[PDB]
Write a protein that binds this ligand. Structure first.
Ligand SMILES: Nc1ncnc2c1ncn2[C@@H]1O[C@H](COP(=O)(O)OP(=O)(O)OP(=O)(O)O)[C@@H](O)[C@H]1O
Ligand SMILES: Nc1ncnc2c1ncn2[C@@H]1O[C@H](COP(=O)(O)OP(=O)(O)OP(=O)(O)O)[C@@H](O)[C@H]1O
Ligand SMILES: CC(C)CCC[C@@H](C)[C@H]1CC[C@H]2[C@@H]3CC=C4C[C@@H](O)CC[C@]4(C)[C@H]3CC[C@]12C
Ligand SMILES: CC(C)CCC[C@@H](C)[C@H]1CC[C@H]2[C@@H]3CC=C4C[C@@H](O)CC[C@]4(C)[C@H]3CC[C@]12C
Ligand SMILES: CC(C)CCC[C@@H](C)[C@H]1CC[C@H]2[C@@H]3CC=C4C[C@@H](O)CC[C@]4(C)[C@H]3CC[C@]12C
Ligand SMILES: CC(C)CCC[C@@H](C)[C@H]1CC[C@H]2[C@@H]3CC=C4C[C@@H](O)CC[C@]4(C)[C@H]3CC[C@]12C
Ligand SMILES: CC(C)CCC[C@@H](C)[C@H]1CC[C@H]2[C@@H]3CC=C4C[C@@H](O)CC[C@]4(C)[C@H]3CC[C@]12C
Ligand SMILES: CC(C)CCC[C@@H](C)[C@H]1CC[C@H]2[C@@H]3CC=C4C[C@@H](O)CC[C@]4(C)[C@H]3CC[C@]12C
Ligand SMILES: CC(C)CCC[C@@H](C)[C@H]1CC[C@H]2[C@@H]3CC=C4C[C@@H](O)CC[C@]4(C)[C@H]3CC[C@]12C
Ligand SMILES: CC(C)CCC[C@@H](C)[C@H]1CC[C@H]2[C@@H]3CC=C4C[C@@H](O)CC[C@]4(C)[C@H]3CC[C@]12C
Ligand SMILES: [Mg+2]
Length: 1128
């Protein structure tokens, strides 16, 4: 209960304590004034005027006191909530970056950004101003009790006898509501994980036609969250129904008991009515604080998962400082019987006792088959996992003894398929070490041979690399990764196929630079080519995860081992949002009629009190008991009907809001899966930004469209009925009562114009924080391997500073507006007493009519606080609704959901390019293609040959129809590709990407994703697996086709996911194959087995090959050489 306030500082405790005592001082005033008011109620034309004027002095002073008490009440709670929400946001991201990679494999980490955004929003709604308004209502209730015990003590015990039942019911239903809040929250987090997985790899979802599959996977969780939110609303309104049932039933009991006392004259008329009126003010106030109770229960439910992640502790601690930092390390490295298994597949033994010995100054070279443990050996050097039954030594001393940061900073890796970050080129090379000068950057870039194209691009070292490097080619991204590793100047260099996507001349220059550089660093080389493996002093060969083969080139060539075999924004009206749920108009009708019939009843008690005071007059005393029994039956039946009407309005409004939220979330994701690749290449649209938008916009709409509308319709009916009753009984005073309406209206106008202005900047800056959070979570291998986690926490905090200041300004603006609203509501009483004195002494109205109007106005003074509490939600609801509708009304150029276009029945695999000129929209000044002419007949094989960065993957993107050419014609089988239906077009193609990526599902589903719109059978999956040469490994695994591949294929090796990408292409039986270096992480045996099945499958269809081999280019039918983006 106080774990929400576990992170409260001393200033936070001071703000919450002063806000608590000022809210206790603020609420207790209304009932306590009744003791001085109730002494003239039981009642020459000057003494009454003096009493009225004196009470006007009291009320004006009370209003002045309320002006500063309500200000401090709101402002200090909102300042404290802003400060501790800032530090919870910092500590949760620090706790995510602290954990080790064994935690990132066995847990769900695409769920964390959605969990972050939506839970911190729920906690900010929960621990803020709602708690202060709750204390205000509690102080009002107990001040009514104090007034009751001063005036008449036998009346207040009968009503105090029910308050533990109200506390019991509120605690029970708040505990149930916190449980359902956690259950609903988990479902929305699963849906956000589906969306963030689908938007991260968007090129494969577009190219394989998987929009409907991802949309159905999203809607499967939206339906569960809907069905939890409905019964959440059921419990949340059984609570208020039981509360008001107890209120009116106990008031019936107390009124029947007070009947006998007033008739037997033990009390007078004045002592009973003050007790009744003060207790009804308090009892209505505690009932209105029930939404604040529900909001606190929701925050308590959200905090469960966030606090645990902070509590969890890693065995390999990244931030700790408890290890040796020796001054001089010669690069000796040695294994001693290393046994290892990954924690996600624990029962598959991988290293079975390895004995490697690397001397300081020489390099080794790891050869072997695919899937034997080479990059596992590389991952155990930098201590990402601990081995099960072994030890790894550097210069005689164990790696478990070193400081983890010092180890990971003295060694420098190159990953297999390297991943850049979504910042500039010089920023990636600065992420390399951390404090680099430009001399170091330019020398390392020349040493990695990346200098010519960086000089060639405009804004040379400032070109924004796309998300994961997607705005660069495959041989430019890898040279930037080589330069990134070289700026560190490591003592131990790890090269895991660093030249896998470079052509032969650049491989020669890179290997000459790396060979010239070595003086005192050890190097581990995993070689793509076995022609440069001969320049190694030691060669290690893996056979079932051990070393059976070690020595020099001729030493292992005369040995007959494994190496021998290898060598041989427009605003939107809110009725436009409520135009979407036209279908449940009976829900809004029943909710609005019950809200009117519930809000009207609070001011009607003045007329009931007038009839009570008139019915206790001089009589025969046998009739007044029989009339007062009729009044008590009326209060009992009013209690039963109030139970039914409160339940109906709340449940009815809540169900309609859940339906609208489900429709808005699915419409937003369906309309986000629709835009073309230029919308995703826009630098504002990262997947972190796009996954914060789906969690913010519909949630901000739901927060103002839920049961809050039922409560505000109730409060507006309350304020209306007060004015109507006032006009009937005295029309002269009611004009002054309505005279404040211009001032409260202008204050509402000014706070709406300021809260709509700062919610804009809040929404603008939370996406820029969520971008950093998502890239640092989803590239956690490279983050941990480079030790830039301190820098990413620093960046997240300095992007998180902004909404703190926005919360400060929101606190002051909303506090001033709530303050002057409550003060100008309490000055109306002083104006009413003075002007009513004037009217009574001139003879217009009467004293009981002045009492009647005053009594009717007190309940509206209750309702204004909740209307002002609703007012800061409507601004962010309007803003997020404008953003949702501009997303819904955006229409792309290449429309993926269109049903019109030519859909020919028979397709001959003929393609033709007639002088295609194309520039990318992000860098639209550089020419990529400069008029491209190539024609491929049926059954031919086009081979694309060129240097690195010539436009070989651009033609695959143009044939896949992501992009439109500027001036040129892409035509297929005679007819132009713009005329064809784009889903038909993308279904006729079969594509293997350059660095392929998978999904976080099973191998059977990743292979069956290759052809949608039909249930692909298990026999077809097994046949494509046998053709792609993966079925021996799949049969070896303990789960055969149900081993869950990790996020983007990280729980497999390079060759295995290359091979599942080839099977995913080949399962659809395409008409044309697009193979963009389809065999680049495979060895010679696997590549020659794959190529035979590809050759027997290519009989009768066309294919386009982009492969850097002399074996697959030479047997091709056409050979195309690129120079300056043209064909030669
Ligand atoms: N994160 C992981 N979780 C579970 N198993 C894994 C993980 N990474 C790899 N494996 C498994 O470990 C075995 C060894 O794969 P490994 O990554 O060592 O291949 P490799 O021969 O080093 O080639 P590469 O250099 O492409 O990684 C594979 O069978 C793979 O299925
Ligand atoms: N999404 C993009 N936005 C802007 N420019 C891009 C984008 N993708 C690629 N480029 C640019 O296009 C040029 C060539 O792209 P492409 O990836 O087709 O070359 P490539 O021949 O595939 O290279 P490699 O053979 O090394 O894989 C590169 O200079 C690259 O900077
Ligand atoms: C008499 C009543 C109306 C006024 C009560 C005075 C209160 C509201 C004033 C007096 C002293 C003030 C504190 C003095 C010191 C600081 C440290 C500053 O870094 C944060 C604000 C904070 C914590 C102030 C908060 C407001 C404060 C506590
Ligand atoms: C700064 C504001 C918010 C604090 C509210 C202060 C409360 C506790 C004060 C404000 C007005 C005060 C009342 C003013 C008049 C009198 C009449 C006297 O015969 C009995 C006490 C009584 C009824 C006071 C009780 C205490 C009181 C209600
Ligand atoms: C009637 C008058 C004298 C009452 C005094 C008003 C005092 C209590 C209010 C008005 C201005 C307020 C300060 C305005 C600015 C901030 C900055 C914020 O980061 C810390 C709280 C702090 C410092 C507020 C503390 C409380 C404060 C000092
Ligand atoms: C929730 C609980 C605490 C509230 C229970 C309230 C009960 C005790 C009160 C509410 C209405 C009251 C009844 C109101 C009217 C009359 C009619 C009279 O001819 C007999 C007594 C009788 C029948 C009262 C008996 C006591 C009574 C039933
Ligand atoms: C729900 C809101 C909008 C309508 C409020 C009207 C009802 C609930 C209130 C307002 C005036 C009240 C009436 C005032 C006068 C009397 C005369 C008495 O001999 C019987 C009870 C009776 C008839 C009261 C019953 C309830 C009553 C009719
Ligand atoms: C008994 C008296 C005080 C009740 C007064 C009712 C007042 C508080 C309510 C009733 C209708 C409300 C207005 C309804 C419409 C809007 C448009 C909104 O974009 C700005 C606020 C504004 C202008 C509201 C201001 C506050 C308002 C005028
Ligand atoms: C809620 C606010 C806006 C209402 C305004 C309150 C003040 C300014 C109003 C309300 C009652 C009014 C007073 C009512 C009666 C009289 C007696 C008359 O012989 C002189 C004017 C005088 C004294 C009025 C002056 C203005 C007055 C004091
Ligand atoms: C603190 C600021 C916002 C207050 C602004 C409103 C002030 C100027 C107005 C509104 C209500 C007015 C009070 C209403 C009633 C009367 C009774 C009369 O016999 C003496 C003047 C007196 C007591 C008025 C004094 C001035 C007053 C308090
Ligand atoms: Mg390429």
């Amino acid at each position: 209960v106080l774990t929400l306030f576990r992170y409260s500082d001393w200033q936070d405790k001071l703000f919450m304590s002063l806000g608590t005592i000022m809210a206790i001082a603020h609420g207790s005033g209304l009932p306590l004034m009744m003791i001085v008011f109730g002494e003239m109620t039981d009642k020459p034309g000057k003494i009454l005027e003096e009493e009225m004027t004196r009470y006007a002095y009291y009320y004006s002073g009370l209003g002045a006191g309320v002006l500063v008490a309500a200000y401090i009440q709101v402002s200090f709670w909102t300042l404290a909530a802003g400060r501790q929400i800032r530090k919870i946001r910092q500590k949760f991201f620090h706790a995510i970056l602290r954990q080790e990679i064994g935690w990132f494999d066995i847990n769900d980490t695409t769920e964390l950004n959605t969990r972050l955004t939506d839970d911190i929003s729920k906690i900010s709604e929960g621990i803020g101003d709602k708690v202060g308004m709750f204390f205000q209502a509690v102080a009002t209730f107990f001040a009514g009790f104090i007034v009751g015990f001063i005036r008449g003590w036998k009346l207040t015990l009968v009503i105090m006898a029910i308050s533990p039942i109200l506390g019991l019911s509120a605690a029970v239903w708040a505990k149930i509501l916190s449980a359902f809040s956690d259950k609903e929250l988990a479902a929305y987090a699963k849906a956000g994980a589906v969306a963030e997985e689908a938007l991260g790899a968007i090129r494969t979802v577009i190219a394989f036609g998987g929009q409907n599959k991802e949309l159905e996977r999203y809607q499967k969780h939206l339906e569960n969250a809907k069905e939890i939110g409905i019964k959440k609303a059921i419990s949340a309104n059984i609570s208020m129904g039981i509360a008001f049932l107890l209120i009116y039933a106990s008031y019936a009991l107390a009124f029947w008991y007070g009947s006998t006392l007033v008739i037997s004259k033990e009390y007078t008329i004045g002592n009973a009515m003050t007790v009744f009126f003060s207790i009804l003010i308090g009892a209505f106030s505690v009932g209105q604080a029930a939404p604040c109770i529900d909001a606190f229960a929701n925050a308590r439910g959200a905090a469960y998962v966030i606090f645990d992640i902070i509590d969890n502790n890693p065995k390999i601690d990244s931030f700790s400082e408890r290890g040796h930092k020796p001054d001089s390390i010669k690069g000796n490295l040695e294994f001693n019987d290393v046994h290892f298994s990954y924690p996600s597949r624990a029962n598959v033994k991988i290293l079975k006792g390895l004995n490697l010995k690397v001397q300081s100054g020489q390099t080794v070279a790891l050869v072997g088959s695919s899937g034997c443990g080479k990059s596992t050996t590389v991952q155990l050097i930098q201590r990402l996992y601990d081995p099960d039954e072994g030890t790894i030594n550097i210069d005689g001393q164990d790696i478990r003894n070193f400081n983890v940061n010092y180890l990971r900073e003295i060694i420098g890796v190159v990953s297999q398929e390297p991943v850049l970050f979504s910042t500039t080129i010089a920023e990636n090379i600065c992420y390399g070490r951390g404090n680099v000068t430009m001399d170091e950057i330019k020398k390392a870039v020349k040493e990695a041979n990346a200098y010519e194209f960086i000089m060639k691009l405009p804004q040379k070292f400032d070109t924004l690399v796309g998300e994961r490097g997607a705005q660069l080619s495959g041989g430019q991204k890898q040279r930037i990764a080589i330069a990134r590793a070289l700026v560190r100047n490591p003592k131990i260099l790890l090269l895991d196929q660093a030249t896998s996507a470079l052509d032969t001349e650049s491989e020669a220059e890179v290997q000459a630079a790396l060979d010239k550089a070595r003086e005192g660093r050890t190097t581990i080389v995993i070689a793509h080519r076995l022609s440069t493996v001969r320049n190694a002093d030691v060669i290690a060969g893996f056979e079932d995860g051990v070393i059976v083969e070690q020595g020099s080139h001729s030493e292992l060539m005369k040995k007959e081992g494994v190496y021998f075999k290898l060598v041989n924004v427009p605003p939107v009206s809110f009725l436009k949002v409520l135009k979407l749920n036209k279908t449940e108009w009976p829900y809004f009708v029943v909710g609005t009629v019950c809200a009117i019939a519930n809000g009207g009843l609070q001011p009607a008690f003045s007329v009931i009190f007038s009839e009570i005071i008139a019915i206790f007059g001089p009589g025969d005393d046998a009739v007044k008991q029989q009339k007062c029994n009729i009044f008590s039956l009326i209060f009992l039946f009013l209690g039963i009907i109030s139970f039914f009407t409160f339940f109906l309005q709340g449940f009815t409004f809540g169900k309609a809001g859940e339906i609208l939220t489900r429709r808005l979330r699915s419409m937003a994701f369906k309309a986000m899966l629709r835009q073309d690749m230029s919308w995703f290449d826009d630098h504002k649209n990262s997947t972190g930004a796009l996954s914060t938008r789906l969690a913010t916009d519909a949630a901000q709409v739901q927060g103002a469209t839920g049961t809050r509308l039922a409560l505000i319709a109730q409060n507006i009916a309350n304020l209306g009925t007060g004015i109507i009753i006032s006009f009937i009984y005295g029309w002269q005073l009611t004009l002054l009562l309505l005279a404040v309406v211009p001032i409260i209206a202008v204050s509402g106008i000014v706070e709406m114009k300021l809260l709509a202005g700062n919610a804009k900047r809040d929404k603008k800056e939370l996406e820029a924080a969520g971008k950093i959070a998502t890239e640092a979570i989803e590239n956690i291998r490279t983050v941990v391997s480079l030790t830039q986690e301190r820098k990413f926490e620093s960046m997240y905090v300095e992007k998180l500073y902004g909404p703190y200041r926005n919360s400060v300004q929101k606190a002051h603006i909303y506090g001033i507006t709530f303050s002057i609203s409550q003060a100008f509501m309490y000055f109306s009483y002083a104006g009413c007493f003075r002007f009513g004195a004037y009217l009574i002494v001139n003879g217009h109205m009467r004293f009981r009519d002045v009492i009647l109007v005053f009594s009717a106005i007190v309940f509206g003074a209750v309702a204004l606080g909740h209307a002002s509490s609703f007012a800061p939600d409507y601004a962010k609801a309007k803003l997020s609704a404008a953003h949702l509708f501009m997303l819904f009304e955006r229409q792309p150029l290449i429309d993926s959901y269109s049903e019109e276009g030519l859909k020919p029945d028979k397709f001959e695999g003929n393609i033709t390019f007639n002088e295609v000129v194309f520039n990318y929209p992000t860098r639209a000044n550089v020419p990529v293609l400069q008029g491209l002419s190539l024609e491929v007949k049926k059954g031919q094989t086009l081979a694309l040959v060129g240097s690195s960065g010539c436009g070989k993957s651009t033609v695959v993107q143009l044939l896949e129809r992501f992009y439109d050419p500027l001036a040129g014609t892409v035509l297929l089988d005679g007819q132009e590709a713009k005329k064809l239906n784009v889903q038909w077009l993308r279904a006729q193609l079969g594509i293997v990407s350059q660095e392929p990526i998978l999904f976080d599902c099973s191998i059977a589903e990743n292979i069956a994703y290759g052809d949608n719109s039909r249930v692909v059978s298990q026999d077809e999956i097994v046949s494509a697996a046998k053709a792609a040469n993966i079925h021996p490994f799949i049969e070896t695994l303990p789960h055969k086709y149900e081993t869950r591949v990790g996020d983007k294929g990280t729980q497999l090796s390079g060759g295995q996911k290359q091979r599942i990408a080839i099977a995913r292409a080949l399962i659809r039986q395409p008409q044309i194959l697009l193979l963009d270096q389809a065999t680049s992480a495979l060895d010679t045996e696997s590549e020659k087995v794959v190529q035979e099945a590809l050759d027997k499958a290519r009989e009768g269809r066309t294919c386009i090959v982009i492969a850097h081999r002399l074996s697959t280019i030479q047997n091709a039918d056409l050979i195309v050489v690129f120079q300056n983006g043209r064909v030669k």
